[PDB]
Design a protein around this nucleic acid. Structure first.
Ligand SMILES: [K+]
Ligand SMILES: [Mg+2]
Ligand SMILES: [Mg+2]
Ligand SMILES: [Mg+2]
Ligand SMILES: [Mg+2]
Ligand SMILES: [Mg+2]
Ligand SMILES: [Mg+2]
Ligand SMILES: [Mg+2]
Ligand SMILES: [Mg+2]
Ligand SMILES: [Mg+2]
Ligand SMILES: [Mg+2]
Ligand SMILES: [Mg+2]
Ligand SMILES: [Mg+2]
Ligand SMILES: [Mg+2]
Ligand SMILES: [Mg+2]
Ligand SMILES: [Mg+2]
Ligand SMILES: [Mg+2]
Ligand SMILES: [Mg+2]
Ligand SMILES: [Mg+2]
Ligand SMILES: [Mg+2]
Ligand SMILES: [Mg+2]
Ligand SMILES: [Mg+2]
Ligand SMILES: [Mg+2]
Ligand SMILES: [Mg+2]
Ligand SMILES: [Mg+2]
Ligand SMILES: [Mg+2]
Ligand SMILES: [Mg+2]
Ligand SMILES: [Mg+2]
Ligand SMILES: [Mg+2]
Ligand SMILES: [Zn+2]
Lengths: 142, 154, 54, 101, 49, 111, 116
RNA sequence: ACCGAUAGUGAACCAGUACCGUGAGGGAAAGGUGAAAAGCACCCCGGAAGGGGAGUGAAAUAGAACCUGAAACCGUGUGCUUACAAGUAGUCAGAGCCCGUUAAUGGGUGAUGGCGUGCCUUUUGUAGAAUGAACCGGCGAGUUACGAUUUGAUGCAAGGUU
RNA sequence: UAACUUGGGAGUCAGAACAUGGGUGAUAAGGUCCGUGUUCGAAAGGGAAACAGCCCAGACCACCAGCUAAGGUCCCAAAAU
RNA sequence: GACAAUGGUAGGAGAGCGUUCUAAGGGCGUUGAAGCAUGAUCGUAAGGACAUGUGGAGCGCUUAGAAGUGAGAAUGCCGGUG
């Protein structure tokens, strides 16, 4: 009836950049997830990827509250028996923080087809630079 | 029924061991050539009303004809020999409809025959006078004698 | 050793992809050009293989 | 210039020359009906109703007055022998906007 | 009263209750007998007293 | 134009005929003949006789030149069965179905 | 008199299948399976005719909240302000406004901030 | 106000047959060309069956278990779609592509999204790993008589009724 | 705004959890037996992830309308980072 | 018009749709019945019409009556096909 629905050839997927020098990953990843789904647009339409892209930078400098960097643990499993691997959040912050932020945001996104597409719009770098300036991005703050 | 149907008695297969259903006879209703469950049986449907009610039915029917102007009293019938062509000419001269009921004091063989072969026309004699007859009729032709005889019965 | 469920038309047909047979190892016979034959085999018509009747 | 009009228990956004569909109205099939519960007015001249704009209105022309598609109501409760089947054509009234204010 | 205009008096005649002809009747599938008892059987019953 | 020829109550089963028809469908007639005459399946002779019948009665009745022809639709339909019995053990029978086919082959000049 | 059960089974069943038209495999060709999936469709639609309303309401809400956040407000303070001011336009029309023209929505927002 | 070929006789047809059993005994299935046989001269493919044309016929799309000819089932062609995806298989929403109706808020398909554990029975309670059903089609279960009781209807009424 | 009396028709005599007063038990059992009340049975919907019995609340039908209940407002997932 | 009620098993009550036959009446049909198939059709429901293809001879409609009067399940029976 008198409701707008969003469509391909009605969406402008913008690029954003989000620095994370002194910031906690949950209180970052929530905002980022809202951005990625499109919760921050008036043309939000749940069967469409109306959302924007994101580039996370200085992910190696991420902050954890408390003794999480020794007591928070990222358990996972290979489908062989006894296939438990575990990594503390700090050791993963040292080796592969890109993965860390990615998984934190992907647990905060849905687990559907569209949601995985929305996860593919994320880009993470523990450094301070990136390749993706070819598409003239913009800084975002909160 | 299950009992009159030329077979059965043999238990077709055993009660157990097979993966087949329980069965007791090949002529049960669930089967193909099986007997029938209740079905119809021979009967009469004739029932009874009281005498006063049935006489009332006759009076009501005749009153309906006489209110509908389907009552026409003729002096008499006199047919030295039967002739349907002559009787239909009579009915035309009396300006009757197709389907009409005709009444006499007695049999009156000549007129019964002169109207035996016409389809819409039926004949009776005031003691064989029927509700079905005088309602399967758009008109009614009756003699003076038969009219009085009906009058004095009813 | 007994199925619990019937095999749908969909699964039946998805399985009956690779059951087909292929075009044989066919070629022409140059003795007669047409009347295609099997490769590395005699021609039934020409009785030939590398020119020589057989 | 659009407007926002409270009708049929609900609100509708209109344009001059727009064909809408509302509930049934006590009105005939080619006559004129007027909306008086205007709530909003748009365009260059915006003005808000609190609750309504004073005296502003909308005139419109009736086109069809008919019965919608036929949904079938079927309810079902399992292993308790209970079902309903009940049909429904919800009426409507089709209008064709002529003027705002 | 002609044979193509017949009609009884009001409420003389009344239609027979057919039983075991679907659940929408209120007398389908158990036919007013309930579930699983001596009274739920063909010939099922006791003497009156 | 079109020509066809049919073969009804064939003893071979359709699953075993259609394998070959999948090789003929949409090909030059001489090519298709060779496919049938070089394939060692047993339905291929029968398909070949249906085909050559089609080419013959095209050349004869509808007056088309045999060269330009291709096989537009070649389809096989289930016919009857003949129900038979193979005695398996312990008094148990096991059914056998001698299936049948309706080999049809339709020939066109492309117009 | 005898009654062959002719024509009526087949009609009543065909009707069900033509309601089942579009379904997967044997659910559009059989009667039992189609029947029972048709009943499921009925109950599912009965509840979806309700879910639909809740869904679209959440949608309107989400869009309005995004617009207010652009104007540095929340949905809550917005709708409170509109309530106090007294204006009674609904979530649907608000979404449509906020989409079609941002000016009028900003004006509503200023009205609400005045309310507060 | 009986059946109308799963009905009615077990038997509409070469049926108490075929078949089963030592034997007493049990015990089937199986109807329809057309008005008329005028029942496809004749040519082609084929070893034949079978088929294609021609001609009989109103009709062969009636060609011999030859009136009609449903469903399951088997297939051929193609419009939309589908190979990063976790599905009681749908429903509600919904773009895009294709078409154009018992022309009315049109039909098909469905990228994607929310919600969503079959039917029956039996159970305190079943998605149930409790039961039953391979699918399709036909057949298949409160009836009849005789009395009783109550309610409704009508008729006559201290009488009614055979 | 129910009740009672007469008459026609029934079905029900396997109950279940929760909370509570108690027995038995081991101040054990999703135990068992009783009293009281509710829900289910025979009740969908919303919360409790999922879950007859728990909390809110009792579906004639439709609506792309609005206020609320329990429960909730960073993201999944509506709404206070 | 106002006001209210309308979840529901066992179960009780009521109003109905349809099927086969029959009586009466009025009617259709080789310029094409029933039956089958297709459709985007009407009705609050069971269910009813209209068209088109097939088909080739019986069939509805109104009122009333009578029933072999409606099937998704019985390790149901018979046949057909997977
Ligand atoms: K209750
Ligand atoms: Mg006996
Ligand atoms: Mg004995
Ligand atoms: Mg078995
Ligand atoms: Mg019999
Ligand atoms: Mg249900
Ligand atoms: Mg009941
Ligand atoms: Mg049942
Ligand atoms: Mg029972
Ligand atoms: Mg019991
Ligand atoms: Mg009992
Ligand atoms: Mg032996
Ligand atoms: Mg039947
Ligand atoms: Mg027989
Ligand atoms: Mg027959
Ligand atoms: Mg035939
Ligand atoms: Mg893909
Ligand atoms: Mg899962
Ligand atoms: Mg879906
Ligand atoms: Mg099961
Ligand atoms: Mg069956
Ligand atoms: Mg116990
Ligand atoms: Mg119970
Ligand atoms: Mg509120
Ligand atoms: Mg939220
Ligand atoms: Mg209610
Ligand atoms: Mg009720
Ligand atoms: Mg009753
Ligand atoms: Mg019956
Ligand atoms: Zn050669």
């Amino acid at each position: 009836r008198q409701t707008f629905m969003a469509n391909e050839s009605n969406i402008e997927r913008k690029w954003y950049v989000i620095d994370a020098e002194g910031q906690t990953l949950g209180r970052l990843s929530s905002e980022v997830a809202s951005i990625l789904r499109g919760k921050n647009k008036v043309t939000y339409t749940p069967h469409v990827d109306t959302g924007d892209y994101v580039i996370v930078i200085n992910a190696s400098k991420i902050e954890f509250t408390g003794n999480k960097e020794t007591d928070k643990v990222y358990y996972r499993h290979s489908n062989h028996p006894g296939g438990i691997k575990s990594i503390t959040a700090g050791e993963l912050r040292r080796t592969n923080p890109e993965r860390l932020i990615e998984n934190s945001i992907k647990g905060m996104l849905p687990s559907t087809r569209l949601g995985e597409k929305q996860g593919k719009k994320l880009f993470v770098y523990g450094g301070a630079e990136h390749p993706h300036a070819a598409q003239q991005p913009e800084n975002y703050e909160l | 029924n299950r009992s009159a149907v030329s077979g059965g008695g043999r238990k077709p297969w055993k009660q157990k061991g097979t993966g087949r259903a329980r069965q007791g006879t090949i002529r049960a209703p669930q089967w193909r050539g099986g007997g029938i469950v209740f079905g119809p049986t021979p009967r009469s449907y004739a029932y009874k009303m009281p005498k006063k009610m049935r006489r009332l039915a006759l009076r009501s029917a005749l009153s309906f004809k006489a209110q509908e102007n389907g009552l026409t009293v003729v002096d008499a019938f006199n047919f030295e020999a039967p002739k349907t062509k002559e009787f239909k000419n009579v009915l035309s001269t009396l300006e009757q409809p197709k389907k009409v009921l005709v009444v006499t004091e007695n049999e009156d063989v000549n007129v019964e025959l002169s109207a035996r072969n016409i389809p819409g026309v039926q004949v009776t004699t005031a003691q064989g006078l029927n509700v079905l007859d005088i309602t399967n009729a758009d008109s009614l032709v009756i003699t003076e004698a038969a009219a009085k005889k009906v009058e004095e019965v009813l | 050793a007994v199925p619990k469920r019937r095999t749908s038309k969909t699964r039946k047909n998805k399985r009956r992809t690779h059951f087909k047979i292929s075009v044989p190892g066919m070629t022409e016979c140059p003795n007669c050009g047409r009347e295609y034959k099997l490769s590395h085999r005699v021609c039934k018509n020409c009785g030939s293989y590398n020119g020589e009747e057989v | 210039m659009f407007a926002i009009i409270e009708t049929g228990g609900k609100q509708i956004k209109v344009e001059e020359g727009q064909e809408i569909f509302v509930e049934k109205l006590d009105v005939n099939e080619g006559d004129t009906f007027t909306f008086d519960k205007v709530l909003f007015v748009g365009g260059d001249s915006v003005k808000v109703g609190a609750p309504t704009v004073e005296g502003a209105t909308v005139t419109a022309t009736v086109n069809k007055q008919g019965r919608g598609k036929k949904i079938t109501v079927f309810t079902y409760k399992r292993r308790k022998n209970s079902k309903r089947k009940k049909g429904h054509r919800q009426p409507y009234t089709k209008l064709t906007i002529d003027k705002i204010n | 009263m002609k044979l193509h205009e017949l009609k009884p008096a009001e409420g003389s005649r009344k239609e027979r209750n057919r039983v075991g002809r679907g659940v929408a009747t209120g007398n389908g599938k158990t036919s007013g007998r309930g579930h699983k008892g001596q009274k739920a059987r063909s010939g099922g019953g006791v003497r009156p007293g | 134009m079109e020509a066809k020829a049919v073969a009804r109550t064939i003893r071979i089963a359709p699953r075993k005929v259609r394998l070959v028809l999948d090789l003929i469908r949409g090909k030059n007639a001489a090519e298709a003949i060779a496919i049938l005459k070089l394939t060692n399946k047993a339905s291929s002779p029968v398909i070949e006789k249906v085909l050559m019948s089609a080419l013959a009665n095209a050349e004869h009745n509808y007056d088309m030149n045999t060269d330009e022809l291709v096989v537009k639709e070649a389809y096989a339909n289930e016919g009857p069965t003949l129900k038979r019995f193979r005695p398996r053990a312990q008094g148990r029978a096991s059914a056998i179905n001698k299936r049948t086919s309706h080999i049809t082959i339709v020939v066109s000049d492309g117009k | 008199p005898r009654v062959k059960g002719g024509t009526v089974t087949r009609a009543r069943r065909k009707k069900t299948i033509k309601l089942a038209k579009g379904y997967f495999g044997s659910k559009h060709t059989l009667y039992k399976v189609a029947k029972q999936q048709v009943m499921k469709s009925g109950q599912y639609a009965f509840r979806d005719r309700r879910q639909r309303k809740r869904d679209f309401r959440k949608l309107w809400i989400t869009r309005i909240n995004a617009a207010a956040r652009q104007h540095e407000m929340s949905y809550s303070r917005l709708m409170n302000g509109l309530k106090k001011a007294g204006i009674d336009i609904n979530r649907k029309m608000l979404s449509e406004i906020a989409i079609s023209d941002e000016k009028a929505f900003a004006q509503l927002v200023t009205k609400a901030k005045d309310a507060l």
